[PDB]
């Protein structure tokens, strides 16, 4: 996260850290006692499920915490539309090997139901332990970063990414993605943040509106970060995981 601030402990208790062979690679969002949603691009086919770990309840990634829990994974289910290096379908369900116990520091975020709409301009928050500037990592002790970003209309994101960007720019799919952020630069999610939550508030409840998916360089100008739009995958999520019940989001 670039341009944001340090969260206080307990603030975003659904945020988790995913490591691969012990190295933090992505975020994710706890959505029940045993399931986490993250980005499919963090789980390439060639990686071994047993080499991942999920750390919950930690605000400083490099500080021991008695409140932190670490779990292995028993299943990884990427969306079947997902193609490596492609934009579509960047979302994956991860099942922890065992259910975890909730606490002040570990609690699930609500999934938005298929028909949920979040108004353009709503200030949502993206969190993570990813880069703080282009190619610059967050320094130890790696305090979780948070950044308020406004949701941007699909028409505008389509303009910014599909019309006003070169052909090698990933394709923005209006039905299944949302961009959120700034054209000004210096405020965005970055490498290492994928899979983490775009948490949007409605009537005092937080919904996983999006999952960090892609964008340009960390904090690049005219390219607000792009997120997988969770509502578009709500029916898929619930059909795969009967335990996960997306919530209807008030008008």
From Swiss-Prot:
The protein, known as: Prostasin
Disulphide bonds in the chain: 26-42, 124-200, 157-179, 190-218
Species name: Homo sapiens (Human)
Oligomer status and interactors: Heterodimer of two chains, light and heavy, held by a disulfide bond.
Role played: Possesses a trypsin-like cleavage specificity with a preference for poly-basic substrates. Stimulates epithelial sodium channel (ENaC) activity through activating cleavage of the gamma subunits (SCNN1G).
Entry keywords, A to Z: Cell membrane, Disulfide bond, Glycoprotein, Hydrolase, Membrane, Protease, Secreted, Serine protease, Signal, Transmembrane, Transmembrane helix, Zymogen
UniProt GO molecular function: serine-type endopeptidase activity; serine-type peptidase activity
Residues included from the entire protein: 45 to 295 of 343
Glycosylated residues, chain numbering: 115
Tissue: Found in prostate, liver, salivary gland, kidney, lung, pancreas, colon, bronchus and renal proximal tubular cells. In the prostate gland it may be synthesized in epithelial cells, secreted into the ducts, and excreted into the seminal fluid.
Any one Gene Ontology cellular component term annotated for this protein: extracellular exosome
Family in the record: Belongs to the peptidase S1 family.
């Amino acid at each position: 996260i670039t341009g944001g601030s340090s969260a206080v402990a307990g603030q975003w208790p659904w945020q988790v850290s995913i490591t691969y062979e012990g190295v933090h690679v992505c975020g994710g969002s706890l959505v029940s006692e045993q399931w986490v949603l993250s980005a499919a691009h963090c789980f390439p086919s060639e990686h071994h499920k047993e080499a991942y770990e999920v750390k919950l309840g930690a605000h400083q990634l490099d500080s021991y915490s008695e409140d932190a829990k670490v779990s292995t994974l028993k299943d990884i289910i990427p969306h079947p539309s997902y193609l490596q290096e492609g934009s579509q379908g960047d979302i994956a369900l991860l099942q922890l090997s065992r259910p975890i116990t909730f606490s002040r520091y570990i609690r699930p975020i609500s999934l938005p139901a298929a028909q949920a709409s979040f108004p353009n301009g709503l200030h949502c928050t993206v969190t993570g332990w990813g880069h703080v500037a282009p190619s610059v990592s967050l320094l130890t002790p790696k305090p979780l970063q948070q950044l308020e970003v406004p949701l941007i209309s699909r028409e505008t994101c389509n303009s910014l990414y599909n019309i006003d960007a070169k052909p090698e720019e990933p394709h923005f799919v209006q039905e299944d993605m949302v961009c959120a952020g700034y054209v000004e630069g210096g405020k965005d999610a970055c490498q290492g943040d994928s899979g983490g939550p775009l948490s949007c508030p409605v009537e005092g409840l937080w919904y996983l509106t999006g999952i960090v998916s892609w964008g340009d360089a960390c904090g690049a100008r005219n390219r607000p970060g792009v997120y997988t739009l969770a509502s578009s995958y709500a029916s898929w999520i619930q059909s795969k995981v009967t335990e996960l019940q997306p919530r209807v989001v008030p008008q």
